[PDB]
Design a protein around this nucleic acid. Structure first.
Ligand SMILES: [Mg+2]
Ligand SMILES: [Mg+2]
Ligand SMILES: [Mg+2]
Ligand SMILES: [Mg+2]
Ligand SMILES: [Mg+2]
Ligand SMILES: [Mg+2]
Ligand SMILES: [Mg+2]
Ligand SMILES: [Mg+2]
Ligand SMILES: [Mg+2]
Ligand SMILES: [Mg+2]
Ligand SMILES: [Mg+2]
Ligand SMILES: [Mg+2]
Ligand SMILES: [Mg+2]
Ligand SMILES: [Mg+2]
Ligand SMILES: [Mg+2]
Ligand SMILES: [Mg+2]
Ligand SMILES: [Mg+2]
Ligand SMILES: [Mg+2]
Ligand SMILES: [Mg+2]
Ligand SMILES: [Mg+2]
Ligand SMILES: [Mg+2]
Ligand SMILES: [Mg+2]
Ligand SMILES: [Mg+2]
Ligand SMILES: [Mg+2]
Ligand SMILES: [Mg+2]
Ligand SMILES: [Mg+2]
Ligand SMILES: [Mg+2]
Ligand SMILES: [Mg+2]
Ligand SMILES: [Mg+2]
Ligand SMILES: [Mg+2]
Ligand SMILES: [Mg+2]
Ligand SMILES: [Mg+2]
Ligand SMILES: [Mg+2]
Ligand SMILES: [Mg+2]
Ligand SMILES: [Mg+2]
Ligand SMILES: [Mg+2]
Ligand SMILES: [Mg+2]
Ligand SMILES: [Mg+2]
Ligand SMILES: [Mg+2]
Ligand SMILES: [Mg+2]
Ligand SMILES: [Mg+2]
Ligand SMILES: [Mg+2]
Ligand SMILES: [Mg+2]
Ligand SMILES: [Mg+2]
Ligand SMILES: [Mg+2]
Ligand SMILES: [Mg+2]
Ligand SMILES: [Mg+2]
Ligand SMILES: [Mg+2]
Ligand SMILES: [Mg+2]
Ligand SMILES: [Mg+2]
Ligand SMILES: [Mg+2]
Ligand SMILES: [Mg+2]
Ligand SMILES: [Mg+2]
Ligand SMILES: [Mg+2]
Ligand SMILES: [Mg+2]
Ligand SMILES: [Mg+2]
Ligand SMILES: [Mg+2]
Ligand SMILES: [Mg+2]
Lengths: 106, 191
RNA sequence: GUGAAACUAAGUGGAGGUCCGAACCGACUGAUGUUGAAGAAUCAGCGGAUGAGUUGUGGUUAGGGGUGAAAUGCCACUCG
RNA sequence: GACCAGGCCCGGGCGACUGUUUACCAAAAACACAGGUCUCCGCAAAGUCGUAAGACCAUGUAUGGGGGCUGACGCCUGCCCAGUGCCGGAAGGUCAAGGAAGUUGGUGACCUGACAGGGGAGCCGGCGACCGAAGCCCCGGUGAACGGCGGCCGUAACUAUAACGGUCCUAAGGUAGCGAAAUUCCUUGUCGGGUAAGUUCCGACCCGCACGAAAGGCGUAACGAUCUGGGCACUGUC
RNA sequence: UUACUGUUCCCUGGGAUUGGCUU
RNA sequence: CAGGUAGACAGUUUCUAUGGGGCGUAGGCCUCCCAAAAGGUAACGGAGGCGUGCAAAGGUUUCCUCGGGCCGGACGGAGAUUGGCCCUCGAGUGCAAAGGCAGAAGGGAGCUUGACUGCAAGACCCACCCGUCGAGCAGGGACGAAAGUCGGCCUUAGUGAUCCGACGGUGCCGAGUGGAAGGGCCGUCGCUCAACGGAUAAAAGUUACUCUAGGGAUAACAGGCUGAUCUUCCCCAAGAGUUCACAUCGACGGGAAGGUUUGGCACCUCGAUGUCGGCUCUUCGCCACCUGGGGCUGUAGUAUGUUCCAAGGGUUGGGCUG
RNA sequence: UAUCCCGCCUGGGGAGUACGUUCGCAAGAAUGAAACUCAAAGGAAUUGACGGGGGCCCGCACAAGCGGUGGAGCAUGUGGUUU
RNA sequence: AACCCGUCCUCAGUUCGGAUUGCAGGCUGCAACUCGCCUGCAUGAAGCCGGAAUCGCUAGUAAUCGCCGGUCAGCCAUACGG
């Protein structure tokens, strides 16, 4: 809790039901190490189908800057928007847990 | 155990019941509507969403839902590109209906009522009524304990508990009749 | 049968808080009686019947007690 | 061919079984039982009965004796020692009778004042620094010892549930197995089976009002003048 | 029975039964 | 001898009122109402309070008047403080209520301790014991110039008999006499003895293993009274009924009878009126389930629906459940 | 390289599972399927990548030093909202 | 320009700091309200070296002072390149 959030309509408009789905996922992965991070960067995109040529694909780029010189870069691609958000959140929880295991190595 | 204490202890415990009884009767009615006994469906198609330019949007915002007949449904999509997305979502939702297409619109056809379905479906209707009665009996079961807990703590008399308890059953039994009344009108819908 | 045993088939043997069932000791059901023949019995079935069995004779434990395979049951038709 | 002379079968509950019990309304699911466990007792034993002498235990000796609970056998018997009990400990605190460092009062051989004041010895008293055990407080152990073994919120992509998480309070919050039961108020719970029709009976679900592990839990062949449901045969029960 | 007041079994101290030499 | 220590054992207690008893509630004092124009007056009748407080909030002398509304003025606003006007007792009087009090009993100031000693004519109250007011007299004093005022508080709750003990004082007694011990007397203190006219310095439960003396003065069954409730009808007709209040229902409310429901009262019965259901065997009532005969119908017919006369006769056998 | 004899495998998952049988006080052992389902599973070795594997080395990478940003006010860009 | 010499300011929101606004004017341009740059006056905000964090720099470098140019009628350039 007490962490800001940044969305970005790269190639589309950000709806409200989508915004609720974003906060639900990263809210789980970040609530664990909530006292290490201050902000959450997000950038949603869309391509293909009716917009462009090729398969419909929606990207979700997520960057995270902790309170102690921590940098995370996560980028995945899926056929739907929610599925893209889900896969990235799993990657953040993996690397975000990797940091504590190194700090708590003793 | 003065009268002012009996009224207060009655008011506290009783309001927890009535405020809890209304929650059950409200949710129990929702359990009936989820059975979806092919009467009319302005509501079934509402929860199905579709993808429109990288945006999950409900069908209600993309197209109109008109019911020309109780056993059918008509969808008038404003965009032909969004027509196929509607057909995908209905099948992947696994509702139990085979949508068709006439090149412009999508038509559903709710199936008829079979004997094997009516019995297996009637078993579900009775089962929900059982889950409603036990919900009330748990409230009768919870309310009477608190009267007994006050009795052991010597804040009420044996005479007061027998009066409140006997008067509390009259309240719950009124709400019980609401369970059958919703069940009676529903059993008529099976035919 | 085996190296020897374990194991295993017959015969002998006659064990058991064993079985059926009289005496004997008990008293589950029902009927009858209920100013009874009888202050708990008669009738028809019923339980145990080599056992923790039954019984005689002669004795022991006496009431703020004794005794009790323990019911507050019994201790001269009398027992919180 | 008379008299005499077993009715049987399927399923479930309780108790293992043979036995014992309220003489005169209760024969049972109660009692006892073999076994199991805890604790006490080294013999001049514990325990028990007695005012005492002494007796039983025992003419026995820890593979024995006394006492409490449980109750064949089979699989198991969990968590809490804060409180209440029991065992052990000994640092200090509290502490009786009694002992006595002393202190104080009454009496008055005398002295003095103007009826009263003071007062030696001796006698008779009161008060009590300090010493003064066990026990209790205190510190640990112990549950087949007495006993106990919780609530309130939110969350899974249809609802519905909640694997998971948060919070409050306790000494700890009920583990295996079982469950409308000899326990379930609501109750004739609900589904299924059985019956033409089943508030009873069997199986299952679990919302266990208020199962639960030696006041034992779950099963269990055999046994029962035990309780309980169904069926064949039989018949004046009808 | 953790109702009141008491009795008994039992534990503990002082005294008698009860003495001697040492630390 | 002393201390500690097992209901192992003994002797006992364990209140009452009560529209039966118990669970509950209450127990004494003050105030208003019920209380019916003196006083007094009950109920498990309706409302609330007391178990004190003040060294000034007492006494005396003396000067003042609060409260509300409007208007004006920095912070300041509905409201602090200040000025003025208008109504006049609407405030306040330590606390509950009633009654009383306006140049005041309310609000300030100055000095003070009568919040005395020894009494007391005569009255109110009233089963008893208690309780209340009090002119006036002496003494020594406070305030006031003086006259005069003061024996606690504007009044009514703020409290506990007796026995025993304790502290201080005392010209009393002193078990042969003188003393002393001890006691008396005076002054006062010590109980939520609140179950509050207090049975002891000191006390809780259970009985379905039970027992005696009594009671229909007192419950459960039945009868009876009552008729809330129950049952069965009637009155009004907003509406429903394709339109149409009354074919059939009839809200909202109203007026009745009946004595089969659950109850209230506790009148008969406690030296006895034996219970639920069932078997057997009756017999009456009608507010009519069928059978007989009619009316209306939103009665085509068949079959109903509602209702009138009518109680002559009839009203099955089984499964589950005591 | 050769001969003789015994046991054992025939794609993976389901599965060493289920039913039944034998043994065992039990825990469990041995014997041992099918339905359905995938077009792979797997072995050796190579090449890179990766490693909270090892060794060596480098850059203002850290350390050390100097001065700033993040705060204040005002330039000016982006988002967002608004239009 | 920093800098040297001399006067004053002596630790103060100040002779530090120059935001915001009014008035009066100028230049560029057909055109200066939204929407240019400057002058003269008067107003004189916040701000007392700055959290968690984070950037540059190893020699004429960092730090600090000012000058020029391009695009350009003019200029919002405190930029960019020197
Ligand atoms: Mg035999
Ligand atoms: Mg026999
Ligand atoms: Mg006998
Ligand atoms: Mg016989
Ligand atoms: Mg016989
Ligand atoms: Mg026999
Ligand atoms: Mg036999
Ligand atoms: Mg004798
Ligand atoms: Mg005698
Ligand atoms: Mg006898
Ligand atoms: Mg026979
Ligand atoms: Mg049963
Ligand atoms: Mg038996
Ligand atoms: Mg027997
Ligand atoms: Mg008998
Ligand atoms: Mg028997
Ligand atoms: Mg008998
Ligand atoms: Mg017995
Ligand atoms: Mg001995
Ligand atoms: Mg037993
Ligand atoms: Mg303990
Ligand atoms: Mg301890
Ligand atoms: Mg479990
Ligand atoms: Mg049932
Ligand atoms: Mg139960
Ligand atoms: Mg039956
Ligand atoms: Mg069952
Ligand atoms: Mg039990
Ligand atoms: Mg245990
Ligand atoms: Mg136990
Ligand atoms: Mg048992
Ligand atoms: Mg038997
Ligand atoms: Mg006693
Ligand atoms: Mg005692
Ligand atoms: Mg006596
Ligand atoms: Mg009484
Ligand atoms: Mg009068
Ligand atoms: Mg009067
Ligand atoms: Mg007034
Ligand atoms: Mg005055
Ligand atoms: Mg004398
Ligand atoms: Mg006097
Ligand atoms: Mg009294
Ligand atoms: Mg009994
Ligand atoms: Mg008994
Ligand atoms: Mg009477
Ligand atoms: Mg009755
Ligand atoms: Mg009666
Ligand atoms: Mg009558
Ligand atoms: Mg009556
Ligand atoms: Mg008589
Ligand atoms: Mg009639
Ligand atoms: Mg490999
Ligand atoms: Mg550094
Ligand atoms: Mg400032
Ligand atoms: Mg400064
Ligand atoms: Mg800065
Ligand atoms: Mg370099």
């Amino acid at each position: 809790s007490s962490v800001k959030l940044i969305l970005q309509g790269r190639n589309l408009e950000v709806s409200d039901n989508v915004r609720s789905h974003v906060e639900d996922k990263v809210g789980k992965s970040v609530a664990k190490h909530s006292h290490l991070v201050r902000e959450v960067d997000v950038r949603l995109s869309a391509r293909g189908g009716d917009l462009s040529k090729g398969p419909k694909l929606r990207r979700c780029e997520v960057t995270l800057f902790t309170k102690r010189h921590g940098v995370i870069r996560a980028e995945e691609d899926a056929e739907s928007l929610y599925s893209s958000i889900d896969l990235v959140s799993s990657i953040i929880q993996r690397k975000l847990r990797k940091i504590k295991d190194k700090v708590s190595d003793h | 155990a003065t009268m002012e204490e009996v009224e207060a202890e009655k008011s506290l415990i009783e309001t927890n019941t009535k405020q809890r009884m209304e929650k059950t009767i409200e949710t129990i009615r929702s359990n009936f509507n989820s059975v979806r006994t092919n009467r009319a469906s302005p509501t079934m198609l509402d929860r199905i969403e579709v993808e429109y330019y990288g945006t999950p949007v409900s069908l209600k915002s993309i197209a109109q839902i008109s019911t020309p007949d109780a056993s059918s449904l008509l969808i008038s999509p404003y965009d032909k590109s969004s027509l196929k997305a509607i057909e995908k979502a209905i099948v992947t939702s696994q509702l139990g209906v085979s949508p068709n297409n006439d090149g412009e619109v999508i038509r559903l056809s709710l199936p008829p009522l079979t004997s094997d379905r009516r019995k297996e479906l009637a078993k579900v209707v009775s089962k929900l009524a059982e889950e409603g009665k036990v919900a009330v009996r748990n409230i009768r079961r919870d309310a009477l304990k608190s009267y007994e807990k006050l009795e052991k703590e010597k804040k009420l008399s044996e005479d007061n508990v027998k009066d409140l308890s006997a008067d509390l059953q009259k309240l719950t039994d009124e709400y019980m009749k609401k369970v059958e009344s919703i069940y009676k009108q529903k059993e008529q819908e099976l035919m």
